[PDB]
């Protein structure tokens, strides 16, 4: 996601974590503010472009070698690669937090988890084709961009009505009520099924596989001819919106559950 989506995921998670989990996270981050998760949710995206952080660029995605839109699927060992991936980073950083939450690696680990659980829920971060859709040029509201950029940025910002932290908090609040009492309320108990703190690979693969299905069902089902030649701010936006909103909600709800597990510090 772009910044807006990450911060939204973060604020959603803030709305669900146990108070003890809040305290655990704040102390790790050295951030006692009311935006403790959202404040750090974008760091990994600028860090990866620094000298020191370059190693972490591949941790943002898993390049699924499938065949969309007619066949989708992700496979850890096939797709991750020898320099790491979103799944491997979830395992690494979760384990740092479980083993050494008071160590010097905890701060970046938590920032990584917050960010990467959001990226896993962006369907094109679970897809190899054209560099996760970066190589698919499209028109959006009369401006040339690419398919990855519109899923990360153009469509979520359009839906949220902007890009600031305040806009992210309001959007998170809207999706949070959808979870608690609204249209996701019946489905959200199933959103944390199979969650296992002792198996980060399996757990984060569930989530990556969930997002990846939408590559076939939603992202690319119109066919590449259509995507190449149609302004995607119209009917494409209209059908995409409920899909990326549910995935942002799920990322926030699942991040919260994962953080509660981490903070529980199980033997
Ligand atoms: N195979 C790729 C390559 C990149 N990206 C993401 C991470 C980059 O920050 C962004 C734009 O290059 O797209 C992705 O999801 N999958
Ligand atoms: C685990 O995290 C540390 C700290 O960023 C990093 O140096 C290392 O590359 C990671 N290990 C694995 C196995 O990905
Ligand atoms: Zn992102
Ligand atoms: Zn992206
Ligand atoms: Zn990222």
Curated annotation (Swiss-Prot):
Quick one: effect of changing residue 45 to N?
Impaired activity
Where substrate is bound, by residue? 1-6, 45-51, 60-63, 73-78
As for family, the record states: Belongs to the nuclease type I family.
The UniProt annotation places a divalent metal cation 1 binding at 45, 60, 115, 119
For this UniProt entry, the molecular function terms from Gene Ontology, in alphabetical order, are:
endonuclease activity; metal ion binding; nuclease activity; nucleic acid binding
Full protein name: Nuclease S1
Instruction: State which residues carry a glycan (glycosylated).
Output: 92, 102, 228
State the disulfide connectivity: 72-216, 80-85
Question: For a divalent metal cation 3, which residues are the binding ones?
Answer: 1, 6, 119
The coenzyme or cofactor needed here is: Zn(2+)
Q: E.C. number, please?
A: 3.1.30.1
Cofactor: how and how many bound: Binds 3 divalent metal cations.
Q: Which InterPro entries match?
A: Peptidase_S8_Asp-AS, PLipase_C/P1_nuclease_dom_sf, S1/P1nuclease
Q: Which reaction does it catalyse?
A: Endonucleolytic cleavage to 5'-phosphomononucleotide and 5'-phosphooligonucleotide end-products
Chain's role: Hydrolyzes only single-stranded DNA and RNA without apparent specificity for bases.
The UniProt subunit note reads as follows: Monomer.
Tell me which UniProt keywords the record has, alphabetically: Disulfide bond, Endonuclease, Glycoprotein, Hydrolase, Metal-binding, Nuclease, Signal, Zinc
Region feature (Substrate binding): 115-163
Q: Which residues bind a divalent metal cation 2?
A: 125, 148, 152
The protein's site described by Important for catalytic activity is found at 45, 48
User: Which Pfam families does the UniProt record give?
Assistant: S1-P1_nuclease
Single GO biological process annotation from the record: DNA catabolic process
Activity control, as annotated, is: Inhibited by inorganic phosphate (Pi).
């Amino acid at each position: 996601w772009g910044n807006l989506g990450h911060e939204t995921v973060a604020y959603i998670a803030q709305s669900f974590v146990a108070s003890s989990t809040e305290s655990f996270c704040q102390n790790i981050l050295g951030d006692d503010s009311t935006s403790y998760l959202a404040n750090v949710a974008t760091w990994a995206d600028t860090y990866k472009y620094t000298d020191a952080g370059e190693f972490s660029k591949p941790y943002h995605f898993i390049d699924a070698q499938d065949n969309p839109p007619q066949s989708c699927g992700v496979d850890y060992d096939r797709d991750c690669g020898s320099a790491g991936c979103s799944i491997s980073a979830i395992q690494n950083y979760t384990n740092i937090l479980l083993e050494s939450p008071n160590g010097s690696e905890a701060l970046n680990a938590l920032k990584f988890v917050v960010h990467i659980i959001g990226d896993i829920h962006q369907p094109l971060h679970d897809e190899n084709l054209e560099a996760g859709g970066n190589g698919i040029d499209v028109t959006y509201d009369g401006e040339t961009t690419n398919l990855h950029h519109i899923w990360d940025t153009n469509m979520p910002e359009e839906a949220a009505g902007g890009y600031s932290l305040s806009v992210a908090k309001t959007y998170a609040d809207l999706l949070t009520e959808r979870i608690k009492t609204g249209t996701y309320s019946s489905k959200k108990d199933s959103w944390t099924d199979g969650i296992d703190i002792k198996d980060p690979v399996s757990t984060s693969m569930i989530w990556a596989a969930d997002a990846n299905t939408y590559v076939c069902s939603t992202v690319l089902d119109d066919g590449l001819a259509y995507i190449n030649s149609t302004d995607l701010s119209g009917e494409y936006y209209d059908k995409s919106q409920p899909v990326f909103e549910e995935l942002i909600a799920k990322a926030g709800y699942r991040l919260a559950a994962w953080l509660d597990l981490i903070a529980s510090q199980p033997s």
